[PDB]
Design a protein around this ligand. Structure first.
Ligand code: FES
Ligand SMILES: [Mg+2]
Ligand SMILES: [Mg+2]
Ligand SMILES: [Mg+2]
Lengths: 100, 32, 43, 40, 153, 177, 99, 162, 161
RNA sequence: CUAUCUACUUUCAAAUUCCUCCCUGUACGAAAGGACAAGAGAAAUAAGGCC
């Protein structure tokens, strides 16, 4: 039949005027994702006489290389990673208003 | 001596009053 | 094969745990869009 | 938007002109008593 | 491998001993510079893909220097290679058929008489000099980038 | 939706990865779509101060098609900064030198002229010829439709379609052709 | 002085934001902003831009219905334009009259 | 269709033509009053540069245009189709209507710059080094002016200059 | 073999947009009654949770729900605690259905009640015009009367049919 | 300029030129006349360095 919009996403919309014609009624139930359209949850992942060692993977990196790594990882420019002076740091409100 | 600039209101008037030629529904050459 | 809940997460484990919380909210009738508490004077 | 269409239906070009949306009372008392007429 | 047209073999690092007069059978005088190869070895080989260049690279080292004045990381590199540390390390762009095993010594007979060679080195440092010595010199509202002014020569 | 507050916020502002095919597409129409996605202007939650831009991946940038004679006529000009450093090259010359330059410049001009523009460009991934790194391929969420419909070539027409079209004129049987 | 003048800009920018968000929400349903706003008026739906932007974010199902209603009214306008007026007006085209 | 041939046999060459049946026009044109084929089929202002099915009928096997007298097209449509065929060729829509490659020529691959609606031959056009001021801006032609009268299904007329 | 207005298929022969056929009026009128009845039964059986509505109040439109607060930008000649009914409801919505007025829904269908919880004035608003004088000492300050309304409840009645 | 600010302080190194010889009394040239590059030597300038 005729649909104003496709009904394969978000919800199925049925538009109907009332008999008097003064009210528009919209029936929009949710469209549940079909099981077929889903993927299975990805499953995560010797002479070891000595205990396993929790080697610290914390490597020192200089500011330039460290900022370059952060910028690449988050797809940002380098500027945001540099610090700012005391004047701006103290200006920031550390008890901002919160709405719900 | 050179075509002087017109007041833009006048230029707007000229454009709105430009000749519009009649367009036949069927081209004359396309008819017997 | 019938969806009961769906949840978002930054990791698959976090999303799976959130989905469980969403399912529990629906089962216990404590969803975010449930009928609000009625304060109308008894009548 | 819709100013010319509204005029074609005999309505005010602005939906805030004449009609139920503007002229009708905004509110009434919960018990059903009518509110005082609005200043506008 | 045999030499093929389009091949680029490695070069070497030499020390500048000085200059001497040389005469040719046509009776012309020529001043030459004596370049002495001291403890020159191949240090590293990098293939075309890994070098980020069209041609593969061969790293060559120069004069032997004290191990007591070198960084730990550099000292570890030479420890694996089995050679005393070098003073200068240069990169030569080579073809895949000119690759030499790291550690191989390079000699002056790598070049032969009658051949031409480009020689690269740091020039004698003259410090901060004026336009006259630096450039030989005795209005858009700004100085152009690249303008010749006094500076380190 | 009865999500937990933190998960709900994460989903609403999450970054999406979009794929765009540039084969036989004009750069500007590709740039116009990429501009909107890189700014987050396609989201109802859009706000300039909210960093709600999305990732845009454009492939086949080498196979873009310029309408008209823009290959010859369109000139890209830059200045090195030195006396006599002004350089002007045509779109064709620039395309051979850098297959992604034309699409990149088209997007750069459309983005807002503010400090957020360079950040938006970081989320732009231009690839010349159908090869996308596996990591970027795993991010992809949706492929946006090509802005220009690629007309079929004469050879690409099926016999049924060729027959369906009528023969407009009767050629003289004595004409060499 | 800036504070006094900014009140004018605040209203202007807020309306620009609602239109941007409504445009984005409409595009998700294949509808251009002028089609949605104008056709909703032709259905005697007087929801303002601020509410429509709020609905797009917090009531997506209701907003899709509004987009579907605008799309339906737009199609009824197309059919009427092709017709000579002999046929009857569309169901959603019918305008309620007030006196 | 007359195909001239030549056969060298017995130390002699014979040149003769061969008359072959041609594609007959589809019967019952919708508008038999139309003077030329385009109007006879209600195709005036209804074809573009990418309608190879329509344009291919008026071009030779090697991409050349056919004479107006042979085709019967009116001068106005003849020029329209002539421009459309030029743009169709420059866009690669007609890859089988090119001159046959002899044994001497070698297969070669050169920069293939995709283009469409190309009014001018790429070689003749010169770069716009100086755009000029806003009031006197040098524009880039897109499409052809001959197709300015084509049916438009949008509220905006075609932009012929970019 | 062709009609008088037949045109061979080409790019410009027909419009680019896909042809749309609207439902038959008679058949569609029957379908509308089924949808209105279905939604009416949901209201009759209370098959809805939280409701939201769009109300027109003080020249303004408010997307509200139960327990919400709205700051009205003027006085309302009402005592704090007074319970009023917001009588101009453009829209009332549920999870699965939405009712739209043309332009206002009937009073029978939806009832929205609110309470006045605070009567106050806004924070001082500076008015400063840069006329050709010493401006600072000539700054005007205005405070506007405000009223805070709490949305108590939104009730829909089964009167669609 | 007792120089606060703007700008700038290595676009690192593809080189130009005039003469002589040669090509050549050759190609062209009715003929006279007379190449061009290809080179060779010698100069100078500029750029870069060097004792
Ligand atoms: S005479 Fe009708 S289109 Fe040519
Ligand atoms: Mg020194
Ligand atoms: Mg305004
Ligand atoms: Mg010197």
């Amino acid at each position: 039949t005729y649909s104003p919009l496709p009904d394969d996403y978000n919800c199925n919309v049925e538009l109907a005027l009332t008999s008097d014609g003064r009210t528009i009624v919209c029936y929009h139930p949710s469209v549940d994702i079909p099981y077929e359209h889903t993927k299975p949850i990805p499953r995560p992942d010797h002479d070891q006489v000595l205990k396993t060692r929790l080697e610290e993977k914390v490597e020192h990196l200089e500011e330039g290389p460290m900022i370059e790594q952060l910028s690449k990882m988050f797809f940002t420019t380098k500027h945001r990673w540099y610090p700012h002076g005391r004047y701006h740091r103290c200006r920031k409100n550390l008890n901002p208003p919160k709405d719900r | 001596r050179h075509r002087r600039v017109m007041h833009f209101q006048r230029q707007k008037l000229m454009a709105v009053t430009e000749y519009i030629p009649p367009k036949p529904a069927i081209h004359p050459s396309c008819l017997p | 094969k019938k969806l009961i809940a769906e949840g978002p997460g930054e990791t698959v484990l976090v999303a799976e745990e959130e989905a469980a919380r969403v399912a529990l909210r629906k089962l216990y009738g404590f969803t975010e869009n449930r009928r609000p508490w009625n304060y109308s004077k008894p009548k | 938007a819709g100013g010319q269409w509204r005029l074609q239906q005999g309505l005010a070009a602005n939906p805030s002109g004449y009609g139920p949306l503007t002229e009708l009372p905004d509110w009434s008392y919960a018990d059903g008593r009518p509110a005082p007429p609005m200043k506008g | 491998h045999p030499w093929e047209p389009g091949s680029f073999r490695v070069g070497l690092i030499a020390l500048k001993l000085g200059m001497m007069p040389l005469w040719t059978k046509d009776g012309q005088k020529h001043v030459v510079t004596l370049l002495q190869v001291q403890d020159c070895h191949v240090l590293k080989y990098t293939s075309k893909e890994n070098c980020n260049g069209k041609m593969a690279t061969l790293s060559v080292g120069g004069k032997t220097v004290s191990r007591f004045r070198k960084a730990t990381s550099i000292l570890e590199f030479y420890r694996e290679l089995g050679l005393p540390p070098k003073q200068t390390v240069k990169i030569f762009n080579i073809t895949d058929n000119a690759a030499i095993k790291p550690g191989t010594p390079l000699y002056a007979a790598h070049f032969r008489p009658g051949q031409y060679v480009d020689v690269t080195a740091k020039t004698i440092g003259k410090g901060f000099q004026g336009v006259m010595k630096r450039w030989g010199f005795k209005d858009i509202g700004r100085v152009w980038p690249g303008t010749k002014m006094p500076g380190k020569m | 939706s009865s999500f937990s507050r933190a998960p709900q916020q994460w989903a609403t502002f999450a970054r999406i990865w979009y794929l765009l095919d540039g084969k036989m597409q004009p750069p500007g129409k590709l740039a116009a779509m990429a501009s909107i996605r890189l700014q987050g202007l396609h989201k109802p939650v859009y706000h300039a101060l909210s960093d709600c831009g999305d990732h845009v991946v454009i492939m086949n940038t080498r196979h873009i098609a310029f309408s008209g004679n823009k290959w010859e006529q369109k000139v890209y000009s830059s200045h090195t900064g030195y006396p006599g450093g002004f350089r002007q090259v045509t779109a064709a010359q620039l395309h051979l030198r850098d297959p992604v330059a034309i699409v990149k410049l088209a997007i750069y001009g459309m983005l807002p002229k503010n400090l957020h523009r360079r950040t938006m460009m970081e989320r732009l991934h231009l690839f010349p010829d159908e090869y996308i790194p596996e990591d970027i391929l795993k991010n992809l969420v949706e492929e946006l439709p090509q802005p220009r419909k690629i007309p079929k070539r004469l050879d690409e027409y099926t016999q049924e379609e060729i027959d369906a079209f009528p023969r407009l004129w009767t050629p003289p049987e004595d004409y060499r052709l | 002085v800036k504070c006094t003048k900014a009140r004018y800009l605040k209203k202007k920018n807020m309306r620009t934001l609602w239109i941007n968000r409504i445009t984005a929400a409409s595009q998700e349903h294949g509808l251009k902003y002028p089609a949605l706003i104008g056709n909703l008026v032709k259905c005697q739906v007087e929801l303002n831009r601020k509410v429509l932007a709020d609905l797009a974010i917090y009531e997506p199902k209701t907003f899709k219905s509004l987009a579907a209603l605008a799309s339906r009214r737009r199609h009824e306008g197309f059919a009427a334009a092709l017709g000579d007026g002999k046929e009857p007006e569309g169901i959603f085209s019918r305008v309620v009259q007030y006196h | 269709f007359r195909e001239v041939v030549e056969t060298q046999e017995g130390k002699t060459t014979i040149i003769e033509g061969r008359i072959t049946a041609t594609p007959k026009e589809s019967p019952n044109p919708p508008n038999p009053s139309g003077q030329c084929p385009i109007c006879r089929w209600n195709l005036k202002h209804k074809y573009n540069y990418d309608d190879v099915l329509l344009l291919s009928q008026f071009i030779r096997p090697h991409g050349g245009m056919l004479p107006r007298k042979i085709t019967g097209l009116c001068q106005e449509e003849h020029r329209k189709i002539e421009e459309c065929v030029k743009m169709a060729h420059r866009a690669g829509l007609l890859p089988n209507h090119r001159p046959r490659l002899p044994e001497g020529v070698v297969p070669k691959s050169k920069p293939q710059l995709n283009r469409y609606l190309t009014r001018w031959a790429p070689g003749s056009v010169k770069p716009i080094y100086k755009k000029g001021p806003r009031w006197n801006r040098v524009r880039m032609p897109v499409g052809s002016p001959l197709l300015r009268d084509n049916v438009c299904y949008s509220r905006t007329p075609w932009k012929l200059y970019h | 073999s062709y009609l008088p207005g037949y045109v061979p298929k080409t790019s410009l022969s027909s419009p680019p947009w896909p042809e749309v056929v609207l439902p038959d009026p008679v058949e569609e009128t029957r379908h509308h009654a089924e949808v209105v009845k279905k939604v009416n039964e949901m209201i009759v059986t209370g098959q809805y949770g939280r409701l939201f509505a769009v109300v027109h109040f003080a020249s303004r439109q408010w997307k509200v729900t139960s327990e919400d607060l709205i700051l009205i930008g003027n006085e309302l000649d009402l005592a704090c605690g007074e319970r009023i009914r917001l009588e101009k409801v453009l829209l009332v919505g549920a999870d699965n259905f939405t009712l739209l007025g043309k332009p206002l829904l009937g009073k029978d269908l939806v009832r929205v009640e609110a309470t006045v919880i605070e009567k106050t004035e806004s924070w001082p608003r500076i008015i400063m015009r840069f006329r050709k004088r010493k401006n600072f000492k000539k700054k005007r300050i205005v405070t506007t009367p405000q009223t805070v309304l709490r949305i108590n409840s939104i009730e829909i009645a089964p009167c669609l049919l």
